Structures are given as C-alpha cells and as structure tokens.
Amino acid sequence: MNTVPFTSAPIEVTIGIDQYSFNVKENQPFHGIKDIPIGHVHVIHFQHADNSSMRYGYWFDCRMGNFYIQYDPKDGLYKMMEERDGAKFENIVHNFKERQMMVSYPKIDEDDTWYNLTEFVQMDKIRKIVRKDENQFSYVDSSMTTVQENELSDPAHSLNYTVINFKSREAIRPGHEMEDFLDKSYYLNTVMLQGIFKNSSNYFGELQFAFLNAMFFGNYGSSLQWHAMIELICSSATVPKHMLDKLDEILYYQIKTLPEQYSDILLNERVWNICLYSSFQKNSLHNTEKIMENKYPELL
Amino acid sequence: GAMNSSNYAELFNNDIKLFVDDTNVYRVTVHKTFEGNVATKAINGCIFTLNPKTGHLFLKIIHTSVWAGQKRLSQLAKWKTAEEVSALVRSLPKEEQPKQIIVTRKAMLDPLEVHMLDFPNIAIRPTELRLPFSAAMSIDKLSDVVMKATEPQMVLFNIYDDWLDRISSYTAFSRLTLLLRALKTNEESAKMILLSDPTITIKSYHLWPSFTDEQWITIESQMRDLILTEYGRKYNV
C-alpha cells in the first residue's frame, strides 16, 4: 500500500484518484491519499471550484518513486513532485497518518474496475505519449491536443498517440486500394500490430489510456484516438480471437464506467453503430453490445 | 468544398478540372430465368470524364468482361471508376493533370480519394448540382461506340463539337446540360427536335448537328419548352 501526500490544500478543489473523487475546501487540512494499490498505474486529477474549465491531473506509478502534491500559487495549480530523500518522505507520510489527515483509496475488495480499465496500461508507454523525460509521472489536461490534431501547435505539450488515418498511404497498399479500404486487416495486423505496436497489449494499452484521458479530462483528441483504435479492429475481417474477446471485456468496463450524463460527446454514434451492427465484428462484442443497448439505446 | 449554383463560374476559369460521372459504368438488363427467378445481364458501360472548359471528353469504355466472377458489382463499379480515373491522370503530362476532380455522385468520393492518394494536391469534390450526365448514352455516337466495344477501350471526343469557335465555355456547358436534361426527361421528343430537319447534318467528327447560330436559338427554345412541359406532367401543376 502506497501513499501520495499533499503539502496543503490552499484552494477549493475537487480531487480525483482513479475513478474516485473528494471535495476539498479552501485551506481544509487535507494532506494526502493513502492505501493506493501497488501494481497498477494511477491518476490523480483536479478541478478547481472556481474554474470548472481545465480538468487536469498526473499519471503515476508508486513503484517508480515517492511522489507528492504541492499547490503552486504562481502557476495556480496543484503540481506533482518527486521526493528523492526516501527518509524525509517516509517521515512526512508517517506523521500525516498519525494525525489522520489522509483519505484512504476507497477500494471495494470485490471490485476489479480499476484493474479492468488499466490492464494493459504501462507507465513506460505513457511517458512516450506524454514526453517529459525529467519527471517519472505524466501531466495531462482538458486542452492538450494530439500530434494528429496538430498536423491538421506547441509540440512540447502534445499527446503523441499513434497516428491512425484510414485514407493514407500507410493504410492502403497500392493495388489493393479497394480491398484494404474495406478490410483493414492489413493495416491492423501488419502495419500497426506487427510494425508499430509490436503486440496487442501495447495497442490495448494505448486504447485504454486514450479512453481514460477522454473520460477524466474530457480531452477531445483522446476520445478521437480511442474511437479510431476501436474502429480499426472492428473494420478488420481477420482479427486474432484473443484480441476480440479481450476487446469485448475492455470496452465493457469502459462503457460501464462512463458517467451517464456524458454519453453525448464521449461516444461517437457512427463508430459505435458501425462496430456493433455493420462491421465484420458485429457479432464479437456481445457484452459490449448488451451493455450499450441497456444503457444508451438512444445513441443507437 | 461542394460545387453549387454559387461557385458555378469556377468551372470556366483556367484551373484544369474534370467532372467524373459513374452512372453508366455498371449497366444491366433485368430478365426472368427459366425457373421464374430474376437475373441480370450486364451490358457494356462507360465512365464519363469531362473537362467543362475545353469540352474534351475521356470516354472510358467498361467492357462486361470486367465483371466476370465478381460480387457486389455496384460497389465494385465505384472502385473501378476511381481506378480508371486515377490511371487517366497518371497517363497525362503533369501540366495537363487536373487540379480538381468533381464527382457527380457522393459515393465516388472515398474510392476516388483512396485511388488518388498519390496526388494529394488534386482536390476531390462533390457537387450539389443535379447534372444530367447519365443521359450521355442518349447521344447516338457515344452509345454506339460503347455498345460495339469488344475490349476495354478509351475513346476521346469533344462534347462541344466546334461551338467554342463561336461561344464561351459557360455558354457551351449551358447548352450541353440543356440538351442532356431534355434527352433525360423525354429522349424520344428530344431526339425528334434535334433531327427533324434532314437538311441539318452531323459532321463525321461531331456528335451534334451543324446548326447555325439562329437554329441553335430555336433548338434551345424547343428543348426548354420540352423540359417545362414534362414537369407539369410529372407533378400535375
């Protein structure tokens, strides 16, 4: 069980940790989150009471260091930092617990939700999408744009997701124009799986990370990336059976976890109706299809 | 973006552009089989690729042999159209390649775009105009060359004959589309109007009769009257 202490809470803010969140009042004595499960990535995110614009947050993994949060009154936001003095850090953590000023990561023991949403997400890959190599943790916010979005402006702040484009030379072998555009199996399996991602777990990891960024920050480019990676699979006639089964599980827990009130902007009608009902894999997403119909029949 | 009544004069500026119409690419007859089921028989078709400024027409003849053993022919037709248009562009010298291709049906956008990936600076555009180019097989000489073909064949024509010696592109295209609209709404009457007078002949190297300027006025008036009449009959107005 690991801990992320907070130096203070000077401004009124809603704090999230993974799918949980807590309201904290201006200069309430809040000093961290404890009992955070080791073994998965995590995200701690913020939304100031005064600016329901710009949700922001930090991906991290407690195995990679001792991290803590500190409000910065110049930049006006809660910053994640690393403490390198291991002794000085257990000291702060232990004194804050003794005073009981820390909330407990509130995991129900039956609940695999977070595992299921992050099964394939690995910190190492996050730090390639969010390049900032002097920190072990990664910042994301509502307004950050992706590399593809930038192509159609500041690259230091870009989400370097893998660029997918169905009408590109990459996607289309010369002489197989019609074949490849109607059956993306080539693009999926050779170009993307074998070529760029190397295996399905990295692909699933990027898909899951894109969804989580869309959900927690309303990051629109991430929503686009998540839909594109689903569509690439659902629009391929030839998919390894281990991928289809896992995809149904992945999407199920993602649809299950979304706030009900957000289905309008986060869920692309065309892609979902095509994946569930028109595509090659229309019949391979039984759990994802059952939950979509029983929760958002409108969008369909 | 899309082509409409507002940006109509762009067709006649000096940016090379082509219209592509695929409506006659996949042509069938529908008949009854011995067991009483329905079957189709393909006949020869053509891609109608036209430069509206110069009148040059690139009539690509689609031989029934193309369909042999293929499924989802109506879908395939769109891809074969885009394949052949792309090959036409590749075959032309750089300075003759179009800057825009305007497809008369929106279903052609994705096939063409995909086939034209090698030409990112050629813009593929839809149109909101309701152009009459499907009636191109009502022009006797075009229908004749399509139906006689025994192999894939490209045949070149100027669809304006020699009109441009005497009128502007704008006026030529309005005449062409008026003639085709008429032939589409009522071929039999349209063709009657064109040939009634046996003393007005079609040159061997032309598609339409050698009307004088005054005779074209009478013709155009006669085609307008034909079109408006058929409208009242269609809608009871």
Indicate which of B79, B80, B113, B114 best probes the interface with A, i.e. most A CBs within 10 Å of its own CB: B114
Q: What is the CATH number of the domain that holds B76?
A: 3.30.420.230
Same domain, B36 and B97: yes
Same domain, B120 and B213: no
Q: How close is the nearest chain A Cα to the Cα of B15, in Å?
A: 25
Cα separation of A281 and A184, whole Å? 12
Q: Give the contacts of A252 (CB within 8 A, at least 6 positions apart).
A: A287, A288, A291
Chain A residue closest to B77 (CA)?
A178
Q: Is residue B117 less than 8 Å (CB to CB) from chain A?
A: yes
Chain B residue closest to A180 (CA)?
B114
Same domain, B199 and B121: no
Q: Are strands A32-36 and A2-5 parallel, antiparallel or unpaired?
A: antiparallel
Q: What is the CA radius of gyration of chain B?
A: 19
- Looking at beta carbons, which residues of chain B come within 8 Å of A168? 117
Domain closes at, from B132, B163, B194: B163
Q: Give the contacts of B73 (CB within 8 A, at least 6 positions apart).
A: B26, B42, B67
Name residue A16's beta-bridge partners.
A21, A45
Indicate which of A166, A179, A181, A186 best probes the interface with B, i.e. most B CBs within 10 Å of its own CB: A181
- Looking at beta carbons, which residues of chain A come within 8 Å of B77? none
Same domain, B210 and B111: no
Check if the beta carbon of residue A78 is closer than 8 Å to that of residue A13: yes
CB atoms within 10 A of CB B29: 9
- Looking at beta carbons, which residues of chain A come within 8 Å of B83? 177
- Cβ–Cβ below 8 Å for B117 and A181: no
Burial A29-60 (b: 16+ CB within 10 A, else e): ebbbbbebeeebbbbbbbbbeeeeeebbbbbb
- Cβ–Cβ below 8 Å for A177 and B113: no
Domain closes at, from B163, B184, B205: B163
Answer whether residue B85 is part of any domain. yes
Question: Which strands sit side by side in the sheet containing B45-50, from one edge to the other?
Answer: B123-125, B100-103, B17-21, B45-50, B56-62, B153-158
Q: Count up the domains in chain B and report the number.
A: 2
Q: Give the contacts of A31 (CB within 8 A, at least 6 positions apart).
A: A5, A6, A7, A8, A9, A96, A99, A101, A102
Same domain, B141 and B24: yes
- Cβ–Cβ below 8 Å for A172 and B114: yes
Same domain, B37 and B154: yes
Same domain, B143 and B193: no
Q: Is residue B79 less than 8 Å (CB to CB) from chain A?
A: yes
Write out the two tokens for B115. 């086939």
Check if the beta carbon of residue B26 is closer than 8 Å to that of residue B74: yes
Q: Is residue B220 less than 8 Å (CB to CB) from chain A?
A: no
Q: HEC string of chain A?
A: CEEEEECCCCCCEEEEECCEEEEECCCCCCCEEEEECCCCCEEEEEEECCCCCCCEEEEECHHHCEEEEEEECCCCEEEEEEECCHHHHHHHHHHHHHCCCCEECCCCCCCCHHHHHHCCCCHHHHHHHCCCCCCCCEEEECCCCEHHHHHCCCHHHCECCCCCCCCCCCCCCCCCHHHHHHCCHHHHHHHHHHHHHCCHHHHHHHHHHHHHHHHHHCCHHHHHHHHHHHHHHHCCCCCCHHHHHHHHHHHHHHHHHCCHHHHHHHCCHHHHHHHHHHCCCCCCCHHHHHHHHCCCCCCC
- Cβ–Cβ below 8 Å for B115 and A169: no
Answer whether residue B3 is part of any domain. no
Same domain, B75 and B123: yes
Domains of chain A, start order: 1-143 (2.60.34.20), 144-300 (1.25.40.550)
Q: Which amino acid is at B218?
A: T
Please identify which residue in the block is written with the tokens 């075959």. Answer: B91
Alpha carbon A103 to its chain centroid, in Å, reads 23
- Cβ pairs bridging A and B (under 8 Å): 23
Chain A residue closest to B114 (CA)?
A167
Same domain, B146 and B168: no
Q: Is residue B114 less than 8 Å (CB to CB) from chain A?
A: yes
Q: Give the contacts of A180 (CB within 8 A, at least 6 positions apart).
A: A171, A172, A173, A186, A187
Q: Are strands A138-141 and A56-60 parallel, antiparallel or unpaired?
A: antiparallel
Q: Give the contacts of A280 (CB within 8 A, at least 6 positions apart).
A: A183, A234, A235, A236, A237, A239
Structural domain boundaries, residue B219: 164-237
Question: Which strands sit side by side in the sheet containing A32-36, from one edge to the other?
Answer: A2-5, A32-36, A103-104
Cα separation of A122 and A127, whole Å? 9
- Looking at beta carbons, which residues of chain B come within 8 Å of A177? 79, 82-83, 111, 114-115
Helical residues (DSSP H) of B51-116, grouped into ranges: 73-91, 109-115
- Looking at beta carbons, which residues of chain B come within 8 Å of A175? none
Please identify which residue in the block is written with the tokens 């006006």. Answer: A76
Answer whether residue B197 is part of any domain. yes
- Looking at beta carbons, which residues of chain B come within 8 Å of A181? 110-111, 114
Resolution, given in Å to one decimal, reads 1.8
Cα separation of B222 and B175, whole Å? 12
Domain closes at, from B128, B163, B198: B163
CB atoms within 10 A of CB B30: 8
Q: How close is the nearest chain B Cα to the Cα of A225, in Å?
A: 21
Q: Is residue B111 less than 8 Å (CB to CB) from chain A?
A: yes
Q: Give the contacts of A259 (CB within 8 A, at least 6 positions apart).
A: A215
Query: B95, B159, B117, B131: which is closest to B20 by C-alpha?
Result: B131
Q: Which amino acid is at A116?
A: N
With both helix axes pointing from N to C terminus, report the angle between B213-235 and B187-195 in degrees, rounded to the nearest 10.
160
Helix (H) / strand (E) containing B215: helix B213-235
Chain B residue closest to A166 (CA)?
B114
Write out the two tokens for A207. 């898909």
Q: How close is the nearest chain A Cα to the Cα of B79, in Å?
A: 6
Answer whether residue B131 is part of any domain. yes
Check if the beta carbon of residue A146 is closer than 8 Å to that of residue A176: no
Same domain, B13 and B105: yes
With both helix axes pointing from N to C terminus, report the angle between A200-217 and A241-257 in degrees, rounded to the nearest 10.
10
Q: Which amino acid is at A142?
A: S
Same domain, B53 and B88: yes
Q: How close is the nearest chain A Cα to the Cα of B37, in Å?
A: 29
Q: How was this structure determined?
A: X-ray
Q: How close is the nearest chain A Cα to the Cα of B117, in Å?
A: 7
Check if the beta carbon of residue B33 is closer than 8 Å to that of residue B39: yes
Answer whether residue B145 is part of any domain. yes
Check if the beta carbon of residue A226 is closer than 8 Å to that of residue A210: yes
